[PDB]
Design a protein around this nucleic acid. Structure first.
Ligand SMILES: Nc1ncnc2c1ncn2[C@@H]1O[C@H](COP(=O)(O)O)[C@@H](O)[C@H]1O
Ligand SMILES: Nc1ncnc2c1ncn2[C@@H]1O[C@H](COP(=O)(O)O)[C@@H](O)[C@H]1O
Ligand SMILES: [Mg+2]
Ligand SMILES: [Mg+2]
Ligand SMILES: [Mg+2]
Ligand SMILES: [Mg+2]
Ligand SMILES: [Mg+2]
Ligand SMILES: [Mg+2]
Ligand SMILES: [Mg+2]
Ligand SMILES: [Mg+2]
Ligand SMILES: [Mg+2]
Lengths: 218, 220
RNA sequence: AAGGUCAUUCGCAAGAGUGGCCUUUAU
RNA sequence: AAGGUCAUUCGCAAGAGUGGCCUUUAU
């Protein structure tokens, strides 16, 4: 069933045991799993994306490119690129959902696989990667489909205005001990908002988005 | 130019000298044409070189084993060590300021991005050039335990397994001009205490943590 | 890495670098 | 990313994955 991936990919392995290893979670083999390929793949793809950014972005200033990169090398973004490859259909895994973290790990492991299989031909792998995703990446940027970091955007707003940082405090924690929903207040001066999520961080991001919003209505 | 000497050490001659010059130029010297963007590309480029090397020659290729190696091998400190081979500091163009380890580590990244660009974005070629200069020295530093230790992390792993607790760090003193400050910090776990000195809290906590680890290996 | 802040340098301002601190994001 | 820990799964132990929390490092 690797052949469907090999077509979506447009590459055929000279060693299918590499491709297999890259699609295989440890809960299906503690002998041959994506972990190591995931390590190389992260470095290899971060490089692809950054290289891409320096090529096409007119504003080449590190203060501009950086927060772009923080998004385009993120698990959240890798999962989107994986959707083009229907990556979840090829993942050797037993007990556990194929959640965003697994998908992203495989996506990293995959490109490591291609790289090594091509004989560590980074030039080839890079262009193959660009063949698949360059237009998708560049279009996300152009159309503003880049996830905003509201906590950082907020704090930079309030530090310029009041030389202070907002306060996030925990309001409630409810649900089964791994299906928890957090509710968090975010406050600056006397402006107060709420957020809810499945991590303390996620709820703080929501509240902070509301707070940015609230400060603009005023 | 003088660039011929660097080019010699490097084993590569630039087609575009301006490209080389930009990688060696701080913004204090030229707000128009300096190393910042190259530095950005280089960080990703060089990290990859390091990582691919680690995966290639290491028997233990576990995530949680390689990552701490990587964490030292892609650090400003370690890049300053590689820079020495090129004598990078005598080529850097900088105006009102010393050429500290941050500048050198920055230029080390930029220079590699510059070779990369100047080669027509040939990553295979650039990676082999890096290796020619640096592969043996890198592998040998790993082999010979010349890898800097993350004491604060080592220590909290020690105290957590033994006592299910993290050491406590408290500020004892600060000394000097707000831009040339010297910190003294205490690390504590149970009744064991050590002191540490540094030019930043983190560096002092690091020295404190190291001594505490030593203390714990005498009694525990 | 980014923002604020203390120091310092570019005569002050604006803007920038470097050093410290605090905080925040991504990997 | 690592360690501790809560939850959960692999029948328990051992080991490992996933989700939460806390802490630490590197870029
Ligand atoms: N918080 C962190 N501290 C140290 N290294 C990290 C951290 N996050 C990511 N890394 C490094 O980046 C590699 C790839 O990360 P990842 O894509 O999240 O699996 C890891 O194996 C580590 O070497
Ligand atoms: N703490 C950080 N938060 C976010 N991005 C970072 C951080 N440290 C390094 N980076 C990213 O890595 C790039 C290279 O870092 P550097 O080698 O320190 O100049 C930066 O330009 C950022 O894109
Ligand atoms: Mg990654
Ligand atoms: Mg992981
Ligand atoms: Mg990863
Ligand atoms: Mg928190
Ligand atoms: Mg770097
Ligand atoms: Mg850098
Ligand atoms: Mg910098
Ligand atoms: Mg900075
Ligand atoms: Mg982990």
């Amino acid at each position: 069933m690797l052949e469907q991936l090999e077509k979506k990919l447009g590459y055929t392995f000279k060693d299918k045991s590499l491709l297999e290893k890259a699609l295989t979670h440890v809960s299906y083999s503690k002998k041959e799993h994506y972990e190591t390929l995931e390590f190389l793949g992260d470095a290899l793809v971060n490089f692809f994306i950054v290289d891409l950014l320096v090529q096409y972005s007119p504003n080449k200033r590190e203060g501009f490119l950086s927060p772009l990169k923080a998004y385009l090398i993120s698990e959240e973004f890798f999962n989107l690129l994986a959707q083009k490859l229907e990556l979840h259909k090829f993942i050797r895994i037993k007990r556990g959902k194929i959640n965003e973290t697994i998908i992203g790990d495989v996506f990293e492991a995959l490109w490591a696989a291609v790289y090594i299989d091509s004989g560590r031909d980074a030039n080839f792998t890079r262009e193959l990667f660009y063949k698949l995703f360059k237009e998708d990446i560049l279009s996300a940027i152009k159309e503003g489909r880049v996830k905003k970091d509201y906590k950082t955007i907020l704090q930079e707003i309030t530090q310029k205005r009041w030389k202070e940082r907002p306060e996030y405090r925990l309001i409630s924690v409810e649900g089964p001990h791994h299906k928890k929903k957090f509710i968090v207040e975010a406050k600056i001066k006397e402006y107060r908002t709420l957020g809810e999520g499945k991590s303390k961080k996620e709820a703080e991001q929501r509240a902070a988005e509301e707070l940015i919003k609230l400060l603009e209505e005023s």
